[PDB]
From a paper:
They are composed of two subunits, namely XaxA (45 kDa) and XaxB (40 kDa) and are only active when the two components act together. Xenorhabdolysins, which were suggested to be binary toxins, perforate the membranes of erythrocytes, insect granulocytes and phagocytes and induce apoptosis.
Most of the complexes contain either 12, 13, 14 or 15 subunits. We used the highest resolved cryo-EM density of the tridecameric pore complex to build an atomic model of XaxAB. This results in a localization of XaxA on the periphery of the pore, whereas XaxB resides more at the center of the complex lining the inner pore lumen. The inner surface of the pore is hydrophilic and mostly negatively charged suggesting a preference for positively charged ions and molecules. Besides the described twist of XaxA, the α-helical tongue αF of XaxB folds out forming the transmembrane region.
Author numbering:
A (entry chain F): 266 to 318
B (entry chain L): 158 to 254
C (entry chain W): 207 to 302
Amino acid sequence: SGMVGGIISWAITGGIFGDKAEKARKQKNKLIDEVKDLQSQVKDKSALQTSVQ
Amino acid sequence: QKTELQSDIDPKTEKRNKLDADREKIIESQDVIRQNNIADMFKDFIPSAKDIDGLDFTQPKKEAIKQAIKQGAEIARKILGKVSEGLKYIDLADARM
Amino acid sequence: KDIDGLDFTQPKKEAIKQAIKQGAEIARKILGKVSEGLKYIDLADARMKLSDQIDQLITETDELKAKIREVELRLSGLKDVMQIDTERTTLLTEAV
């Protein structure tokens, strides 16, 4: 938002939202790695259900 | 004991199903704030469709320093209005979070 | 409005800022077409993901539809064995 006229406000909203952009991206880092791990359980259990049957 | 716990499945299947709509009501209200983009916001910071009018009504103020304050007025407004719209989006997301 | 861009700005021919008035709306409309296409970016990437869902689903069906092939290939083979006992009775009760 800031630097259109507000060079001072660049650090303001970047301090406010750039944290929350970074935090949501870290949630985006964490959950994609979990879904990739949760998909890997489904892949083995699908191969498991074939193996048992 | 089997009938004890399936009678506890029924609140948890409903309470999950209650929060499914209450999640999506936040999502529908986040879509209003979603609706303008990065550069729609940057399109608003230029006072164009009034920026010629920003220099039409301020033709004798070229000797005045305060013409730039008239320029600086509405940009100082609209920088704040987009903050609060996103600041609504902060409290809107943290509920959903 | 470009004739009107020079109709309303006739005394500004001495002014350099007439070109800024010219430069104003073009700097607007270059951004408005970006965001319309930037909507189209997020709109396509949903569909790009949404097509890949169906790509898995068609793959997961025929892999599973290959499974009912083997079951039906087995079950028809087993019902063939079940008919053997029916004709084993007609063989033997005659031969008894």
